[PDB]
Write a protein that binds this ligand. Structure first.
Ligand SMILES: CCNc1nc(NC(C)C)nc(SC[C@H](NC(=O)CC[C@H](N)C(=O)O)C(=O)NCC(=O)O)n1
Ligand SMILES: CCNc1nc(NC(C)C)nc(SC[C@H](NC(=O)CC[C@H](N)C(=O)O)C(=O)NCC(=O)O)n1
Lengths: 213, 213
């Protein structure tokens, strides 16, 4: 009996777990959730995430939330080589660039991507000040990324981590704007990305969320 | 032998490394970085963290950064009970609530903490509407916490774990500001903090912060 990825396939949080599991090879069924009815906020979803969010990933009697916790369990079933926790120096850095995403990448991206995508489709318009400010930010943050792989071939060094995979969900949405010309004038990160895109679980993902939202 | 933790102790990121370090019994020295002279952007420090912030650990010729990455190292070096790896249900409980603090506890404490401590250092002032408006987000996350620590001794189990220790830092800073009464309305969160104040290692950081009494 496979795993249920709860919540909508639009969200890069959720198209984060599924990049984990599809790369994992896990067994995952996505079960969509109704925000319209508030079913993310029932007793029925107040076992799967007691704040009231998605993703979850139910597994037997397992209720795991948060995106990046969830995306880990993918790793330690499926290819634990994604984690690399045979090595307290290699697990070290895989957790450096796991975190560098949540706090330096996404954190600059998110601001561009709910201004050119969440806000407009909600009736507000693109606030271009706040587009510009985080573009800059995401520039800076893109410098480091270039260096890191101007040297190492990847992010936690020279193997496929959970770190890299964690990057694509939200990055695909840049390519859903014309704002992913940033990715190109840094040459080592661009070509890095393509790599992931080439990989054929970005592709299930990169068509998972393409169709509908 | 010895581990190097860079960054001022006024940072509460930095005091969250340097408390995972204490429980784990590691061997760390805190070398100060200093914001005023911009020691953090020194072409020096950009080798311990290319972004330009504290913390970074130095261990060996290995540098880490990102608080949460480096409280992984401490648990994954000198005390592997703290993560419970090799037990996917318990090791997965832990990662979860490591996101929980990151996204639900601190993500509301942050701007409380900034409003009432940092902000007065620059401009004179605290935005009491910010303070009030993340206060109630924090009252909201508490209630889960109350739910979960009636099910459980500690956060991820009845084991102690990274999980509760990653909280200790900001909760302390929370007793700096006048809103540290909010944990009275929730008795089981009160136990568990005060419980976890008894630890040698929480007090070692209690008086790294305040001078002492
Ligand atoms: C462009 C697409 N962006 C978009 N569209 C919509 N549309 C809607 C149907 C909401 N849904 C989503 S995020 C849902 C959200 N999750 C979270 O932010 C959870 C993220 C958390 N840090 C972790 O990874 O668990 C949550 O529960 N919302 C909190 C709540 O409503 O209480 N994204
Ligand atoms: C007594 C005041 N304590 C105080 N005052 C200020 N701001 C003002 C006081 C000036 N800074 C903070 S710590 C959070 C942040 N570090 C980063 O977030 C680090 C990024 C990463 N997530 C991490 O955990 O290391 C930063 O301070 N680092 C600064 C940096 O970016 O270099 N606290």
């Amino acid at each position: 009996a496979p795993m249920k990825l709860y919540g909508a396939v639009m969200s890069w949080n959720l198209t984060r777990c599924a990049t984990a599991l599809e790369e994992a090879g896990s067994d995952y069924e996505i079960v969509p959730i109704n925000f319209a009815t508030a079913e993310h906020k029932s007793p029925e979803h107040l076992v799967r995430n007691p704040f009231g969010q998605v993703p979850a990933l139910q597994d037997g009697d397992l209720y795991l939330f948060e995106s990046r916790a969830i995306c880990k369990y993918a790793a330690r079933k499926n290819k634990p080589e994604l984690l690399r926790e045979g090595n307290l120096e290699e697990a070290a850095m895989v957790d450096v660039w796991i975190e560098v995403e949540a706090n330096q990448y996404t954190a600059a991206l998110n601001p561009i991507l709910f201004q050119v995508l969440i806000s407009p489709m909600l009736g507000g318009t693109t606030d271009q000040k706040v587009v510009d400010e985080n573009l800059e930010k995401l520039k800076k943050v893109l410098e480091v990324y270039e260096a890191r792989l101007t040297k190492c071939k990847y992010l936690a060094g020279d193997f496929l981590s959970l770190a890299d995979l964690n990057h694509v969900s939200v990055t695909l949405c840049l390519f859903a704007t014309p704002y992913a010309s940033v990715l190109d004038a840094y040459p080592h990160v661009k070509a890095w990305w393509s790599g992931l895109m080439e990989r054929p679980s970005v592709q299930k993902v990169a068509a998972l969320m393409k169709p509908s939202a």
